[PDB]
Amino acid sequence: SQDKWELARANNYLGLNLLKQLPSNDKTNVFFSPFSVSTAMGMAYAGARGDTLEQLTLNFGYAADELNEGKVLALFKEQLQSTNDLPHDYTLNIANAAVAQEGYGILPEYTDALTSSFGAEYIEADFQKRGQEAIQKINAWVSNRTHGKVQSLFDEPPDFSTRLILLNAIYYKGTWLYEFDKTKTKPRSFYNGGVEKVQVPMMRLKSTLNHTYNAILNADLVDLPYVGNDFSMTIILPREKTGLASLKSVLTSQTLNLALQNMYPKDMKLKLPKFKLDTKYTLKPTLEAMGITKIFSADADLSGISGSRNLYVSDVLHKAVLEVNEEGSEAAAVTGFVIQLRTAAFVTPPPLPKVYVDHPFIFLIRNSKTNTIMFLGEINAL
């Protein structure tokens, strides 16, 4: 459907723009869920009016009158049901909420939209008088919704003047279609920051994988499907050891899709690090860098939340957790070299091609059906 495609495109545009705007250095890994950020923007969209709404939509190239709010919420609703219907092999715990200063008003149309479209809760708290209790209620909510994988979003009470905060926490561990062999996992060389050689737990696979070399990105792309090929992890490995910054500067929704369309199966050797990521961002400054300003300003119009223009977003908090290890459903298979033999002979198959993920790279976990990027990582450092 062209509508599902348009939502995946907005989502992927937001994700790759976030990646170019997030603070980073050669010693720390970036990891976030564009899907979670899209959900925080969806929650604002469902309640925004006037110039606040027009800035949100025009950011994605739409006048508010080129959109049906109903059809946008229905596309989010469809996305939510597809994630709730994932098999047991996927551990995906999503926690979405708006937390408002008490006594501003809540429209049931808005809380109904939060539940059905976003799996989101609306929570009232007193940041002025009961800041300490507000963070105990939030920490308990996120702990409950993430099955204890995220215990806290706040260490200290937020500011006296806090009006509304958007919270999006997500945990993911998937099962590979093709298991890596636990016995082949060893410390192997990785270039931290593209420069500093260290030994790190490296998994080893020999299998038929979708792959392409893409000249515009100057990178190998490898697809590793999860079970039911519902999600796949795309590795984008720059050919230059220090190529990551260059890769980031040319990676767009357009250039990614062109590379993905050229992938075809082949037998290959893959070396991929075993790693866990746990990241937390205060997204207001990054979203403002991208041109989302009015939701955060004193002139915000979120009258679709409360029934009046009395709310603005104090901040957007995002926490994302990923585990990557060997576990898969089926053993690794290679097709082998196919030859039509006429005359009996000694036949030497050509050497298998190699993608050794041994320097900084990007990965995307995406919905194979819709090409929605669920997760995006830059690994600089293991």
Side-chain angles (χ1 to χ4, degrees), residues 1-2 5 7-8 10-50 52-68 70 72-77 80-84 86-87 89-108 110-111 113-123 125-136 138-148 150-154 157-172 174-181 183 185 187-196 198-203 205 207-228 231-239 242-253 255-268 270 272-273 275 277 279 281-316 318-322 324-326 328-337 339 341-342 344-346 349-368 370-382:
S1 139
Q2 267 301 304
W5 168 84
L7 180 66
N11 171 87
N12 291 0
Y13 166 76
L14 185 64
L16 303 169
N17 274 342
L18 264 161
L19 178 65
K20 309 196 201 237
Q21 292 283 357
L22 276 177
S24 72
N25 61 59
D26 284 8
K27 273 150 187 282
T28 81
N29 294 333
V30 172
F31 182 62
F32 64 95
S33 154
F35 174 57
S36 295
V37 179
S38 286
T39 298
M41 294 302 91
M43 294 166 67
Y45 168 71
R49 296 283 173 99
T52 299
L53 175 62
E54 282 264 25
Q55 194 184 52
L56 273 168
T57 65
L58 280 170
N59 197 74
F60 297 99
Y62 299 89
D65 59 27
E66 304 173 343
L67 291 177
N68 195 297
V72 169
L73 290 191
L75 286 179
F76 277 113
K77 189 173 207 309
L80 179 73
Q81 284 167 339
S82 92
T83 65
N84 288 354
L86 289 175
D89 285 322
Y90 295 85
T91 315
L92 188 47
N93 307 139
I94 316 291
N96 294 313
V99 188
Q101 181 68 33
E102 61 176 20
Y104 277 94
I106 306 164
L107 298 179
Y110 183 78
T111 54
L114 254 50
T115 301
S116 46
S117 293
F118 306 112
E121 286 84 54
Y122 201 91
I123 300 163
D126 190 338
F127 296 106
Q128 282 161 223
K129 290 191 169 192
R130 306 228 278 146
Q132 183 75 84
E133 185 262 303
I135 73 190
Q136 135 172 218
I138 291 163
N139 290 345
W141 159 84
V142 78
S143 187
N144 175 258
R145 298 290 293 104
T146 69
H147 301 130
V150 180
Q151 293 293 351
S152 95
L153 294 173
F154 292 100
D159 193 273
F160 175 97
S161 67
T162 297
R163 190 68 56 103
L164 171 77
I165 310 174
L166 304 179
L167 309 179
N168 310 88
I170 186 162
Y171 174 81
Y172 179 75
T175 306
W176 298 119
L177 182 52
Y178 303 120
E179 81 203 20
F180 293 79
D181 192 321
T183 72
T185 299
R188 296 181 175 98
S189 295
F190 187 92
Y191 290 74
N192 284 0
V195 173
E196 191 78 76
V198 300
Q199 305 299 127
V200 318
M202 189 80 79
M203 313 185 293
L205 188 63
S207 189
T208 317
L209 296 179
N210 280 299
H211 167 277
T212 185
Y213 165 73
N214 187 268
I216 279 169
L217 300 182
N218 186 26
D220 296 292
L221 291 88
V222 187
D223 219 60
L224 288 171
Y226 291 99
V227 186
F231 292 170
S232 24
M233 176 176 291
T234 308
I235 309 305
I236 314 181
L237 185 72
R239 279 288 174 78
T242 56
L244 189 58
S246 188
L247 171 60
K248 296 219 276 145
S249 76
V250 296
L251 189 60
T252 67
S253 198
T255 62
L256 169 55
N257 282 0
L258 290 185
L260 294 169
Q261 268 163 26
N262 287 9
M263 281 172 99
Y264 69 105
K266 64 197 66 156
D267 296 0
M268 48 182 290
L270 175 65
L272 181 73
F275 60 88
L277 301 168
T279 50
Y281 306 99
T282 293
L283 285 180
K284 167 169 62 178
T286 306
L287 288 169
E288 288 181 331
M290 283 180 248
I292 311 295
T293 69
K294 292 294 206 178
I295 59 162
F296 299 118
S297 63
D299 60 319
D301 190 336
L302 301 182
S303 55
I305 308 194
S306 66
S308 84
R309 305 192 188 98
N310 59 2
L311 296 174
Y312 68 89
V313 176
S314 294
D315 223 302
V316 180
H318 176 50
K319 190 152 201 319
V321 185
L322 180 69
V324 170
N325 68 10
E326 295 94 344
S329 71
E330 299 174 11
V334 282
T335 44
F337 192 42
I339 52 196
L341 212 53
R342 316 297 199 281
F346 183 82
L352 284 188
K354 290 165 188 201
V355 176
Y356 285 7
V357 178
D358 78 324
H359 59 270
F361 63 102
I362 287 180
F363 66 86
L364 336 168
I365 298 170
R366 46 196 192 85
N367 185 310
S368 286
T370 68
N371 202 44
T372 303
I373 300 160
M374 301 292 294
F375 299 101
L376 190 171
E378 320 176 29
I379 310 284
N380 297 286
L382 296 158

